[PDB]
């Protein structure tokens, strides 16, 4: 109800609940590049998998290689012409699609590269297979670091995002789970996910982002919802450099009230490297410990949840955070020492599993967050195809990426 | 030469300019205030309320000339660059439905006001007898006064976010991408 | 009630205090009264106007009898809704929306966005990450293509020749991917030749596949040895930039502390919190009995540590004369021993004070040095336990990946008290043998960028002794401190000597200089400052 | 010790990045024998163009009288609409006469609109621009760099203020450095005072966390704390910020609805006009200004207070009447 | 602009009777305008007047009184009434008293002020809203005077 | 000759500017018939401010501001001496620092009168409810 300014408590695992974790990964997701000077690069997933494949975490969880989504599946939310354009555009014939490159906003903000359709299909199939496995009870927590995009609209490509696999996973979750809650904990607010469920009540979005004429420009205490979606779109705008304790104090009570009033049957988490320490885009000061503590807080209630990797521009920090999140989801803590992997020389000079908080000024005053939370809780008072729905995915357990050499 | 226009219609035109260029809005293709019915209503209202001393022939000549001028004037100096794409879409639809396009019947009175505002420059563009210019300007001023007499019936402000019939709809991002930047 | 509703408009006018805002308020009231604005928006607007006046706004609410979307998401017409997706069933059609959409170009009014500012060290790190990512992406794509092609050629060679001649393959090479091998071929060959090489590999394997695999193996060997070669440069560059990249405030602190420690800055701060009560808000509980109530001195040994720092800077400085140096040291020692209860313990390692601006600025410098050193002392045990248990990873130690020539010049913080170590480092910088940049790097490595306030400890100590020299050069401040010495009698005889004390310090002061009352209780080591603007001056 | 000048590793590429010498490698023996300007003439805008050769003028693909899709271009040296006359009808053949005078005989009873109907096709297409006899009658509206509307947005948008030092030129991500500059106005050297909590909240150099973010309104220069208004950061792009102490421009009522799109300013010989007729109620639909065609009424303070009290007491009266009707219905129930 | 007519037959009766006996034989009126308007104010302002502002009605009464004071010898008399006004001016001159017409004229002099009011209202630049409010106030006053024919 | 203020011919009255006939006992101003040069009331208005000074300046703008609590017409209170008065004809359709205190007292009196009006209306409604209840 009021911002209590409680200090950052340690990350309690509370192992009373044991969650069967299904990690979805494809070896082909890291072999696609946007180009030099571009913030988005899917190569960060490969080292996130490598850190996962170097802690012995495969002995506590199920690895999965999802079948990539087809045109009949990504068109469950996107228009047919957008998917038809995306499956034929390559960076050698853009002049033949000069109209559709600016119609669907595929220019310089979202460039064209080889395997773009393949990467989008991989991400969509991963999200779909994770949601189908969560729906049938085959897993307790589904991990989808291999691709996840919140900026993608119905027929618009924006935010270095092309295919909104999050809404596809939510749609898959919507066929059995009635009430789904989408939690966003990064900067560059998920306007695509929020606007895709703005006028519905069975799915509501909660985003902790940055406002003040940032890149998305969407997210406000007045952005609440229209039609049947009134009081079913929650935005918590934050200023620059919110630290770990401030993020905990602004994250835990609103989540507690949200699930004490909405009580969702499914959770979609959008953890990412956008709200981490100093990277190419983003101004938050939330370190590894607070970012993992938010997810561990979400893990404390034992709700069947989705964790989806989103942004990330500095691959070492986002890989460290995703590895610690995977370890926390398996009811264990990881040592700060980094094991020897294929990207041993990639990480920082300390070579430790830690993202250092950049000592910069925090402008999130207690009274601003107090009035934001009072407005949010006032808005919260009223809250009281051929092979779709497919759980068919390859096991992919024979592969390994663990290094046992010098 | 010179035209005197009511100030309320000038404010309506400036609001149209704001809605198109700044607020990025376009008029509704299913117009209920179209140029043909508005001109016919004006002609009948000024013809059934007074006698015919021979000036009604001149008024019908002016109405027919305005209709013929709006038939082919809409695609040349009207139609801001944003709303050109809707015009192309309806032209393609009309050509697909084997029907020649008549913009008098499917465009509202805002474009008629735009034509009236531009009309002095078109008058100065061509070489005309001055008495003909004075007569045409007098008829245009009388029609503008009549339009001011029914300003609320044909021009009403309504937010498209709160109502579906507001003579102005929002534009999708695909519309902005195709119409502007290409 | 009686004679209250008539005076509501005059009360509102005197409360607003601005004529333009009063005219806007009257315009809002009028447009309410023209049956244009409803009661709820009127009450909300008055709440924006009256606000903190709880009684007046509550009476307004009692008098008036009072008890849908944001700046984005404009609604599209239903004509554009009918965009066939061919994948939407009834549930997708009923749970998704096609009318209310918002775009980033609409939220910024087509004026763009401002990216967050990053220092050039962060840009160097971004360049390093881009280069490492490009090298590793090329390495991994080439290695995956080599794995696929080596499986292909093994399956070629282990069988006989008739199906070796005809092994027509679809795109994908029997794998889940479609174009990674195409990308590798296009990168290793020309643009116009990669297509034809891919075509002949698809339509005629077993003639060209082993040769292209050998070529890719040679290219991968070159790429691997070059990545090994450049990784040393990339590792050495990021070691000197990473702590600079994290320290967003440290590189600007050299200018920020110089800009915001002058006399005018402290005058403005203390006058701002002085006027922070003298405003439209009502006066309650003798407002402003103390200007700030925030100047306590909890620690003690910090007194002796700052005294040692000042002694070292005095022995280093060549500005003041040696008798001036000795008299400055004695004056600082006597001022510290008299303003507090310290009886000059060894350093070998309610009472008021009416004074001018110079003593105030000097004591402000004393307090800010004390506050920075106390902030360092607060996390001393935690940072000592962290620096004493920083276990280096064994594989990094074996591979010589550990950071060299950063703390190997004696700038390490392991095995010693961190607060004493930073005190010794500040003393060495005061004499000058340690580069200021290297001191900042050592502080960043030790305290994890939490000690950017100690970057200019030498400069603030220089300002400290400079303002202490102003305490002993003019007769006005000398008379003020002499009267301060005469004021401290190890006893309290206040409420009688205070008035003539104020008059006497007024006789040694100008008719426009701001008075500062430096109060200090006998216990709890508390000092507070009263900013007097000569309101006590009755002349 | 960095020294990246040598150690070039040209084996792959001397360039730190990816030079194209691997593309220059040519082992392929595996087969082994088994004048036009740059703006739209109708638009004055950049982008893709369709350029004619007989004239330097070029148009956009959509801004043409037969608006053509870029995916199906007309082949055969397409000419502009003006160029569809010079080397075509009415200028090349059947020339040596004024075709405008000959056009009069084709149509009748359109004599006042005859040569205009002749001249309509003799001109190139052009986007609609409001002529300089309508828009200059409003002193706040302006024509933008692309012909866009502009009345009260943030004037002179930043062009060189996007680059600065590590101190952020437009925001407060740094420490207390911008606090004494922003909290003190340069006109009088006095601390700016927030309207909600009447204080400065300047904080201190020792404790910058106590300081609060404050910026003035763009119209009335009202100092407002960022924590006293639903605002996240500074409004320095797009439109000017408006503090909540201003009269609304357009409002909606609902019990379909009304808009009341303000009054606007008419500066054409100051035509806006003023008139002081009778007080105690006028039905002026707003558009007032305070003294101590488009008609701005003249209304003073006592008229406003009398109208407000009349509205309040009328509301009390109708409420009383509704209560009387409810009690009458209750007494007819018995 | 037009004023409703119910009791203006008294006005034409006076118009016929001014040439006979002037319709008034007492130079100071027994029932003057001051007490007539005071009884009107005490009658309507708390019986039919809605709560809120009564300042429009008080300002109407004050303006009517002041206009009557400025209606001296101007469209308010007949020829015999002009002679009566000359006699009143003569007898108000020897005692140097400023002759106010409110305390000397009856309700018969109000009807000629109200009847001529729309013609001179239309004779000046007057906003139509003010004309509507003024004719509404005069209609109200005449409606109140309809049930008070004793003063008539 | 005639008399527009008498509706008859009668006697003659001369005027220096635009001589229009009247009666000596029926002058437009109520002054002594026996005299020097006399201007007509419309002529007096013409020579007051319409000739050379205060003509562009509108005195009606000051006149509306200087009659407090009398605002039903500033026009008819101004143009009452701007023309020559005539005999009444039956129309054809029948056959500072102290003004603020004063207006504050007037506002208080109006609010009080509204308060007794509200109290009497309430009391009447309450009595009506009471004697309807006892039936």
Numbering used by the authors:
A (entry chain A): 1 to 384, 405 to 426
B (entry chain D): 220 to 401
C (entry chain B): 661 to 727, 750 to 1031, 1135 to 1324
D (entry chain E): 33 to 66, 258 to 478, 488 to 524, 536 to 577
E (entry chain F): 222 to 373
F (entry chain G): 261 to 294, 298 to 358, 540 to 579
Article sentences:
In Saccharomyces cerevisiae, cryptic transcription at the coding region is prevented by the activity of Sin3 histone deacetylase (HDAC) complex Rpd3S, which is carried by the transcribing RNA polymerase II (RNAPII) to deacetylate and stabilize chromatin. The five-subunit Rpd3S complex contains a unique subunit Rco1, three core subunits (Rpd3, Sin3, and Ume1) that are shared between the 12-subunit Rpd3L complex, and an Eaf3 subunit that is also a component of the NuA4 histone acetyltransferase (HAT).
The five-subunit Rpd3S complex (Rpd3, Sin3 (residues 214–1536), Ume1, Rco1, and Eaf3) was reconstituted using a baculovirus/insect-cell expression system. To visualize the structural architecture of Rpd3S, cryo-EM structure determination was performed using the purified Rpd3S complex to generate a three-dimensional (3D) map of 3.5 Å. No density can accommodate the predicted WD40 domain structure of the Ume1 subunit in this high-resolution map. Rpd3 contacts an extended conserved motif of Sin3 (residues 748–801) that we term the histone-interacting motif (HIM) as it coordinates the H3 tail substrate binding (see later sections). At the center of the Rpd3S structure is Rco1A (residues 258–561), which contains the PHD-SID domain (plant homeobox domain and Sin3-interacting domain) (residues 260–374) and the conserved acidic patch-interacting motif (AIM) (residues 377–397). The density of the N-terminal chromodomains (CHDs) of the two Eaf3 is not visible, suggesting that their CHDs are likely mobile in the absence of the nucleosome substrate.
